[PDB]
Amino acid sequence: VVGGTDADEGEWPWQVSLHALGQGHICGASLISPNWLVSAAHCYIDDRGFRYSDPTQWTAFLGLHDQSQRSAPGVQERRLKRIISHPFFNDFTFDYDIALLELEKPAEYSSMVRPISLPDASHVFPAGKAIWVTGWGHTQYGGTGALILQKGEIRVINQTTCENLLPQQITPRMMCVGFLSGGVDSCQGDSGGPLSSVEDGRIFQAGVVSWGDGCAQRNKPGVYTRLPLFRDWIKENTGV
Numbered sequence: 426v427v428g429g430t431d432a433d434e435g436e437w438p439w440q441v442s443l444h445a446l447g448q449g450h451i452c453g454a455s456l457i458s459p460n461w462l463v464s465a466a467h468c469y470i471d472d473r474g475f476r477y478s479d480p481t482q483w484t485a486f487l488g489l490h491d492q493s494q495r496s497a498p499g500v501q502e503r504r505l506k507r508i509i510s511h512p513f514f515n516d517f518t519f520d521y522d523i524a525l526l527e528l529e530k531p532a533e534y535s536s537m538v539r540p541i542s543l544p545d546a547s548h549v550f551p552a553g554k555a556i557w558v559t560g561w562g563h564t565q566y567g568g569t570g571a572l573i574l575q576k577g578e579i580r581v582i583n584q585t586t587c588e589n590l591l592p593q594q595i596t597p598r599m600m601c602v603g604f605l606s607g608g609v610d611s612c613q614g615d616s617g618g619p620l621s622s623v624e625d626g627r628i629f630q631a632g633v634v635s636w637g638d639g640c641a642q643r644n645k646p647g648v649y650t651r652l653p654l655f656r657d658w659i660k661e662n663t664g665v
């Protein structure tokens with residue numbers, strides 16, 4: 426996250442960190458039940474010969490605050506049973522950039538480990554709404570990840586504006602969120618993490634960090650997968 430600030434301990438207890446064998450933190454995810462996470466398909470594609478699609482080469486950290494303190498109180502470490510990539514995911518366009526990760530053993534809910542509510546298929550996040558992005562991604566384009574979980578408040582962008590700003594690249598599965606003046610944005614390593622929409626104190630996951638043209642540039646807001654469209658796919662494949 427570029428332009429954000431340190432999250433408080435326990436503040437985003439649905440945020441998960443996904444580590445790939447021998448590489449440290451690579452992507453984010455969100456807890457939606459004791460057994461299931463939501464993440465980005467593109468994180469789990471074989472590439473450069475490393476087998477990112479191999480569920481046995483991932484470790485999920487739940488309840489994590491600081492990447493240098495992975496044995497801290499409240500952290501739950503889990504292996505993955507399987508990765509369900511969306512069948513329409515396209516690795517050239519990044520259309521349908523979503524995946525479901527099954528934990529080997531269930532999480533135990535705690536002050537630091539809690540699920541986030543799914544939106545039903547009719548749920549709207551209108552252009553202009555302020556929502557939150559979190560992750561351990563880079564804090565500058567071309568920089569390094571954050572040890573402490575970062576948070577940033579960003580705004581939903583109009584879909585026509587989004588299309589014109591990133592021409593020939595936006596599909597209806599995608600939403601632009603950020604600021605047209607840049608400054609606050611997700612970045613490499615935030616992929617797969619949640620957009621958290623805070624209302625009356627109810628919180629919904631609005632989308633999934635997917636991609637961007639650089640990070641925090643003017644007129645180049647981050648691009649996110651829209652979660653309401655996938656409610657029935659999640660139910661069908663996980664029961665959640």
Ligand SMILES: CC(C)(C)NC(=O)NC1CCN(C(=O)[C@H](Cc2cccc(C(=N)N)c2)NS(=O)(=O)c2cccc(-c3ccc(CO)c(F)c3)c2)CC1
Nearest residue numbers: 467470472516518594611612613635636637638639640647
């Ligand atoms: C293994 C596999 C082949 C699947 N690749 C993979 O997973 N690549 C990841 C893809 C996701 N990545 C990025 O989009 C990065 C960083 C980033 C990440 C998340 C949010 C933001 C943000 N700003 N909110 C920014 N941004 S980037 O460096 O500009 C870059 C590098 C490579 C590729 C494309 C890219 C994007 C879109 C299109 C479609 O038009 C495209 F053609 C290229 C952008 C890392 C790298």
Ligand SMILES: [Cl-]
Nearest residue numbers: 555578579580
């Ligand atoms: Cl504002």
